Design a protein around this ligand. Structure first.
Ligand SMILES: [Zn+2]
Lengths: 59, 93, 159, 191
RNA sequence: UUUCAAUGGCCCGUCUUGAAACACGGACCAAGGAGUCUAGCAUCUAUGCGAGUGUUUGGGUGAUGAAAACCCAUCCGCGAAAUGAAAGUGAAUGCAGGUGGGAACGCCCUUGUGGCGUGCACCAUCGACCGACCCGGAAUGGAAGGGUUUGAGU
RNA sequence: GUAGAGAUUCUGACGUGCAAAUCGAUCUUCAAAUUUGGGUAUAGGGGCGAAAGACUAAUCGAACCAUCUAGUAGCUGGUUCCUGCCGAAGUUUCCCUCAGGAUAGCAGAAACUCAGAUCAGUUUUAUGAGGUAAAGCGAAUGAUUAGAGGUCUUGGGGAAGGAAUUUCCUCAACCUAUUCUCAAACUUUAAAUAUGUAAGACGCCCUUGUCGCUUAAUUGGACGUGGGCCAUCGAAUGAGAGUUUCUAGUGGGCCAUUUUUGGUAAGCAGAACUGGCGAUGCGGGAUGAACCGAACGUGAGGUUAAGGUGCCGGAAUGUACGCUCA
RNA sequence: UCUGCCCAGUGCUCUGAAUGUCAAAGUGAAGAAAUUCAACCAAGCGCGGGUAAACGGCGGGAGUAACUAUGACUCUCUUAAG
RNA sequence: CGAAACCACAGCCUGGGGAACGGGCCAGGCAAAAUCAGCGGGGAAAGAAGACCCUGUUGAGCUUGACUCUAGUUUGACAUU
RNA sequence: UGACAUUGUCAGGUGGGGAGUUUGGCUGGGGCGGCACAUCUGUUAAAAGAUAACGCAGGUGUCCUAAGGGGGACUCAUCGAGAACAGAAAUCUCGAGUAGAAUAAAAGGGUAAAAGUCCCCUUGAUUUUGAUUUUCAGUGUGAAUACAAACCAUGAAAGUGUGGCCUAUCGAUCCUUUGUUCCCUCGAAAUUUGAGGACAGAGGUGCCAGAAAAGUUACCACAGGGAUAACUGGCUUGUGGCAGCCAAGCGUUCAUAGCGACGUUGCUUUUUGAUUCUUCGAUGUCGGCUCUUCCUAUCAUACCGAAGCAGAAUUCGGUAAGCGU
RNA sequence: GUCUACGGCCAUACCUAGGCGAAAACACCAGUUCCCGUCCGAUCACUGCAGUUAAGCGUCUGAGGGCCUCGUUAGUACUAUGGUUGGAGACAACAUGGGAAUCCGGGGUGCUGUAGGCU
C-alpha cells in the first residue's frame, strides 16, 4: 500500500553529517537593506575612501 | 460583478504619466486571423493523408475566466489592460 | 486531514492573554531598534499586518534591516542536515528586546569596572564565572533546636 | 484507552442513559438524621456500564426498602455515564461511566444502627459491577465534607443551619449584618 | 594422510522485512558462457606547448622495400569579448580600485594563542567599466546625467 | 439387417500404449441430401464452411517458410579471482506516477583551504516561547440528577356570591445559595520532557572623518579613523575544523519499549520517540532476525556481563528463616 | 389453429416543396495586389407521408423498511402502445 | 534381451520454534548387515515459467452513435465537348 | 443513345465493409462507491517545528464599485421600568449591559471614542524594480510581508491605503488574441500591404507541474506477481451455542426440586466476515463409497446419588469413551 | 501635599453603599449674534461667569463582590530516567530527578514621569 510516510531514520541521517551552520561573513550584501539606506551608504563609503586616501597622500 | 464605465487611474502613457480618466471596456479575443504563421503551419501539417496531426480540445469546463478590463485614455488615446478575478457575470455601469 | 494554511494550528498560539485584549500598549512603538540588536519574536493576534509565520513565534534573532514600522529579524532554521538563514520582516508590535542582552551588557560593564578597580588596587579581579560550588563545612547547632524523632505513620482510612 | 467521547454537537446520536434516577431514600433529609455514611468505591479503573448501574440500583433499592424501610437509607449513585463505547450496528451504542481508583461509586448515609444493613447492602451490590470494589465507613457527617468531631463541635457552637438535606455553614467572610440576622446562636468571639 | 572420541555445524544461489523451508533453479562431469566497441559529454589525473594550440584533408624524401618513421604550405577547429530577438554597440577615475579574513617573507617584543609592514590563492563585501532594459533626454545621431534593475561579462 | 460408411455407451482396455487418438463389446446408417478413386478450381484478413470459429498437410479466434530482427520489455533469471580501507536506503518534492524515473537526503573517491579561531544530538547560568499531563465546573461554553426560597403580574383548573385584569397547588418558566458527575474538537491556571538565543578582542571607553539618508539642528543611523584597557580573552566538559568536484546504490522495509488513532479482535492497519534486524557474528532465554548481555583481526593468561551450580552440563545434593501435597 | 396493439425512438423508403444551410468552382463590389466582403449552387440535412413476418416495446420512474442496500412502504408519470 | 520419468543432498517418529503443518534446527522416543512380493499414508511426489485473479502506460479476436482514417458509393465543378 | 453518359482531376456527403489506435489514477485484491487527485478551519497533534489512514466535525473554485481606501460620528446582542394600541415591546423613551451582537460564505483567532452601525469623499482593486515568508528541491505555481521609485485618494494633521481584519477561493511549453513604441527584421536597394520579433496580459489544460481517446472476450495470448484476490494454511469471534456468580422472583405454602429476568466472569465456534504472514516456473477443488484412529461436550449399555408407597417417568444428572450407534 | 494638562504600567486602579473636601483648578452652570450641526443649542459648536458643591472629581470607611500578593492544600496530583519489579491484566510500589493546579486562610485596595497653578 502506498503513502508509507515515516520519520524514523530522517533525524539519524541529518545528524550523521550534523546540522551544518552557515559560514559566517563579516559583510552581508546590501541588497537586503533599504534602497535609500544603500544608496546613501554608497556615497558615504565613497567619501570616506577619498578622505582616507587624501590623508594618506598628505602624510 | 459591477464595474463602472469610467474610472480615474494612473496612465502609463508617455504623454500623460499621471492619474487620468479612463473608459472601461471588457477585453474580447480577436477575429483569429488566418494568415498567422502557426495557422499556416497547422494547415500545411493537416494537408494530405495522416488524419489529425495536433491535439484537439474535447473536454470543456471552468466557464468562469479572468476578467480583463480595457482602459482607454480620453485625449492621449492610450490603452491599458487590467486583470480582475474570476466572476460569472460582468456588468458595466 | 492535513491542511497547510499560514495560520493553521495557531488557535492558542495567536490568542491574546486573558484580560489582555483590546488596546495595545504604545510603549512598543516608542521602543528603538538598531541593526545588530537581539530581539525576541512574539506574535500579537491584534496586529494582522506584518505577521510572521508561526514557526518564528517564540524565536530569537538579530536585526539586519530597519524600516518605517518593521524590523529585519534574522533566524536560523533547520531544514534537515543544515541551518538556513531566514530574513523575516516583522512589525515592531511582534518584536521585543531580549532581557538577556541587557543582563549581558550590565555584566560586561560590571566586569570592566571590576577590572579597572583591581588594576588600581593591584590585586586579583576574578572576572570569570563559576558553576555552583559544593557546600562547605558548617557547624549546625542544637541549642533551642533539639532534634525531633520521626516515625512512619500507620495506614488509616481518610474518607 | 480511547479518548473521551462525550455527547457534543459533532456527534449528537448518543443514546439515552439506561439509569435515570440517581438518589433513593429521604432526599429531603435533615442534619440530625443520617449521621453515618457508607461508601462503595472501585479499586481500579473500569468502564462500568449504565446497564450494570441500573441493575445495582434496582437491587439496592429493593433490598434497602424491604429490609430497612423508606426511612433508613439515602443511597445515591455518584457515577454519571458520559463516555461512549462504540459497538458496530448489526457509532454510539451505550453509555459507560469512567471511574478511577478511589472514585466513589455508591454512597449511602444511614443512622448508627443501620451500619450493618448498609454494609450488607453494598456487599451484595458488588456482584453487579465489573472489577473489584471496597466498602469504607466514612468519618464525615453524612455527605458533608466535615468529619464527625468537626461537625459536632460546629453544631455545639451553633454555626450550622439546616436547609433541606444539606445545610448552611458559618464562614468568616461577608457582611456582618447578613450573618448576624440569620444566626441567632452564633457566638462571635471578640478575641 | 586415514580413522576414532568430545563439542559445534540445516542446502547452495536468488527475490525478499523475513528461507532450511512444504518458494524457485540445481542428477554428474568436461569445454564454452554474459558491462564490449564506437560518436559525444562531464569530473579528476598525467604529458607537451602556452595567448596560443592542433604535423597525419593533403604534399615530399619514395625507387630501392617503406600501411611505419621523418619533413612541409595554405585554410580551418577551439581559445584570446561580451551582450541583445535584432538592427547594433562593445569593457582602466585610481597601484586594473577600497574593506575583512588570509600563505609566504621581512622587522621588533621577549616567549607569547605576541605585536608592525606589505600582502599570492580563495571567499564575502562596497564600488568602477561593457552590453541589454527602464528613464530624464539637454530629418538624422544619443554625446554627457542617471537607475529600485538585468548578462553564462571586464 | 451383411459389405461399406460412422462413433452412443461401457465415461471398458490402453493411457512413458500397437497407436501424438488405437483396441474390444455395444451402438447409428446402409439404395440415396449415399460412399468413394483419379483429374481439376478456389490461398491466408484469403479460401472454404447443412455454421463447430469448424477445416485449410499432427499447425487455425487468421497456415507454413525467409527477411526486417540481435524487434521492444518500467518484468523474470543469470552475471566468472583475492585481500585491505570505508560503507547505506526504503525518506522529501515532482512525473497518466503506485513493480518505474528525476530531485534532495544517506556513501565513496579526489582533493583544497587552514590550523587557534571556532564548534558540540551535553550540562550550567541568564533570558524568551508553548497550552499536553494535571486541575476546575458553586469561573466563561457545552453536557448532567435532585432538593430549599422568591416569583400574589395567566406560563396551565375549577372554586370562593354563575361571577372577575382579586387569590390557591399540582402545570410549566426565571432567578438566588449550597449540592452529584464530565469535555480530543471547554477553560481562569498549568507542569515534567522537549525547544529559541547569549556566555566580549570582529570586545569596552574617548578624538575625528564621509554621506545625495535622516533630524529644527553634527541631530541621528551606518561605515570608518587614531589612542587607553591584551596579566580569569570573561560558565563546565570534550575535541582539529571547514568548503568544494564527480559519481554509485537506495527510493517495497520490519521488530521491540514508551505515547497513540481506526477497529469486536487480530501474528490487523496507520502515526511519534528511541534502540535494533535488514547489513550483527558471539554468551543466555531447551529452539528462534529483533528479547537480556555484549558489537567480532590471529592467539596465550586472568576476570566478568546476562545467565546458572541434582544428572544430561562447567559450576555448593551451599548456608539461614518460613510456606506448599496438588 | 392463430400470428393481437404500438412508427414515440433507431433503421428503411418516398418528397424536392423548404432554399434553412453549404464545399469546390463560377459571379458582383472594394483594394495596387495577394486578399476581403456579398450574394450563387447540387447532394446531405430539418420537416412531411409510409413501413414492425424492420430492429424492438406492450408499462417508465421518483423519496423510502433493525447494518447498508432495500422496495416493504410514501407517491407520481402511463404515452407510441398498454 | 533390456528402458524411461524423476534425481540440491537424502530418507524411522513425537513435541517446540520457524516464511504461521520439517528429513535436517532444539528436546525426546530410539537405533543392527544384505534382501523378495505387494501397497497406496507421506515425500506439501512428477508433469507444465497457474489456463482462476491482479499488475503491465504488453497484445490479439470481436463490437459500436469511441478518436483518426479508408475501399466503395452519391452529388457538384472543370476538361473531353 | 448522343455532346448526354463514360473517363480524368478536385471538392462536399455517406461509408465497422475495412485499417490503425485509445478506453486515467488512488483503492485494506480488483470492480462499484467516493476523491482522501489542486485546497482552508478545529481535532487525531503526545505544550518548539514536523507528523499518516477511504480517522472525526466541517468548508472551497464563489461573492463584493462596495462587502475596497480614507475621515468623522455613534455603540452592540440582551435585561428591567414606562408610552400607546392590543399583545405587537411593531414602534418611542430612561437606566443596566466586557461584547453574551456584528464582522459576505465553514471554523479558529482579532476587534468597543473599532476592525461593528451610520454619514461624506474617493478608486492604493494604479505603473515599475529589487528583497523576504509559506508550501519548498529553499525549483515552479498560488498566496502573503516590509521597503524603494511615480501618480493619487482621504483627513485639519500626524498618518493611513499596492483590494477584501488574518488563515482557502487557482494555471506551464507550443499556438491564437490584446496592449505597448517616432522599437527591430523580411538578409541585392527602396515605398506600401502582409508577415515575423522584443516587453506586458488573457485564452485551458479540476487527472488542477497541464495526453486529443468507447466497449467485450463464456475463443483467448505474453511478461510477471503470493507486492495482489479466489483457493490453501495460520490468527481473530462481530454472531451463535455453552459453563459459573449475584436472587428479585415462579414453583396453592418453601428465594437456588426444578425454571429463574436484569447484569457479570469465562469457554467454544464447523456461521461468514477481518488482514494479506506461506503458496500464482502448479499443495488436483464438493458430495457419496471404503477404511482406520482419536476426544467427551454420554444416545444406549455398567455401577451410583436426588426427591414421592411402590411400578413407570425426570435430573444423564456422579464416574465412565471399554463396547455399539 | 492638593489640582490641572499630557502620559507610563493598564483593576493592590473595577463595581456597590455610606461619611468628608479650606484655597485654587476642574466641573456643574448663564445665552445663541458670529463659525458649526441637529426633530430638538439634548450632544457637537461658539460667547460668557450670575448662581451651586449638589453631581462629576479626590479621599476615608465595608469580618463588601472582584482584583493583587503570600502561606495551607503539598512535594500531593502529574512527570523524565530504571529494573529478568509485583500483578493474568487494568494498574501499583520502589530507585535517581523535576514539580502543579485548585480550595482555604493572612495581608493590601494604586504607584509613578514631565510641565505648570494652590493659605
Ligand atoms: Zn493618458
Amino acid at each position: 500500500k502506498s503513502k508509507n510516510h515515516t520519520n524514523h531514520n530522517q533525524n539519524k541521517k541529518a545528524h550523521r553529517n550534523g546540522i551544518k551552520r552557515p559560514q559566517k561573513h563579516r559583510y552581508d550584501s546590501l541588497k537586503y537593506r533599504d534602497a535609500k539606506f544603500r544608496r546613501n551608504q554608497k556615497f558615504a563609503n565613497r567619501g570616506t575612501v577619498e578622505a582616507i586616501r587624501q590623508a594618506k597622500a598628505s602624510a | 460583478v459591477n464595474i463602472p464605465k469610467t474610472r480615474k487611474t494612473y496612465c502609463p502613457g508617455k504623454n500623460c504619466r499621471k492619474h487620468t480618466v479612463h473608459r472601461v471596456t471588457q477585453y474580447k479575443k480577436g477575429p483569429d486571423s488566418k494568415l498567422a504563421q502557426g495557422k499556416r503551419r497547422y494547415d500545411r501539417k493537416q494537408s494530405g493523408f495522416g488524419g489529425q496531426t495536433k491535439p484537439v480540445f474535447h473536454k470543456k469546463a471552468k466557464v468562469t475566466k479572468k476578467v480583463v478590463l480595457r482602459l482607454e485614455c480620453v485625449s492621449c488615446k492610450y490603452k491599458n489592460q487590467l486583470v480582475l478575478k474570476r466572476c460569472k457575470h460582468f456588468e458595466l455601469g | 486531514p492535513h491542511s497547510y494554511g499560514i495560520r493553521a494550528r495557531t488557535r492558542y498560539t495567536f490568542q491574546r492573554g486573558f484580560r489582555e485584549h483590546g488596546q495595545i500598549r504604545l510603549s512598543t512603538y516608542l521602543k528603538t531598534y538598531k541593526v545588530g540588536d537581539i530581539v525576541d519574536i512574539k506574535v500579537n493576534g491584534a496586529v494582522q499586518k506584518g505577521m510572521p509565520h508561526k514557526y518564528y513565534h517564540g524565536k530569537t534573532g538579530v536585526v539586519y534591516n530597519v524600516t518605517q514600522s518593521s524590523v529585519g529579524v534574522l533566524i536560523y532554521k533547520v531544514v534537515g542536515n543544515r541551518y538556513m538563514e531566514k530574513r523575516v520582516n516583522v512589525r515592531i508590535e511582534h518584536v521585543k528586546h531580549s532581557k538577556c542582552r541587557q543582563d549581558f551588557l550590565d555584566r560586561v560593564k560590571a566586569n570592566e569596572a571590576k577590572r579597572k578597580e583591581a588594576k588600581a588596587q593591584g590585586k586579583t579581579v576574578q572576572l570569570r564565572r563559576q558553576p555552583a560550588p559544593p557546600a562547605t563545612a558548617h557547624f549546625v547547632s542544637t541549642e533551642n533546636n533539639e532534634p525531633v524523632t520521626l516515625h512512619p505513620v500507620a495506614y488509616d482510612t481518610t474518607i | 484507552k480511547n479518548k473521551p467521547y462525550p455527547k457534543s454537537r459533532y456527534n449528537r446520536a448518543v443514546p439515552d442513559s439506561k439509569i435515570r434516577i440517581f438518589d433513593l431514600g429521604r432526599k429531603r433529609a435533615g442534619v440530625d438524621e443520617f449521621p453515618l455514611c457508607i461508601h462503595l468505591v472501585s479499586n481500579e479503573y473500569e468502564q462500568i456500564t449504565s446497564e450494570a448501574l441500573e441493575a445495582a440500583r434496582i437491587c439496592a433499592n429493593k433490598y434497602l426498602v424491604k429490609i430497612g424501610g423508606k426511612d433508613s437509607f439515602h443511597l445515591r449513585v455518584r457515577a454519571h455515564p458520559f463516555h461512549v463505547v462504540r459497538i458496530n450496528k448489526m457509532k454510539p451504542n451505550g453509555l459507560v461511566a469512567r471511574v478511577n481508583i478511589g472514585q466513589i461509586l455508591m454512597s449511602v448515609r444511614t443512622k448508627d444502627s443501620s451500619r450493618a444493613t448498609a454494609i450488607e447492602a453494598l456487599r451484595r451490590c458488588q456482584y453487579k459491577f465489573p472489577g473489584q470494589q471496597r466498602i469504607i465507613v466514612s468519618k464525615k457527617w453524612g455527605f458533608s465534607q466535615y468529619a464527625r468531631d468537626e461537625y459536632i463541635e460546629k453544631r455545639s457552637r451553633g454555626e450550622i443551619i439546616p436547609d433541606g438535606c444539606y445545610a448552611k455553614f458559618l464562614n468568616k467572610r461577608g457582611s456582618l449584618q447578613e450573618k448576624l440576622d440569620l444566626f441567632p446562636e452564633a457566638s462571635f468571639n471578640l478575641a
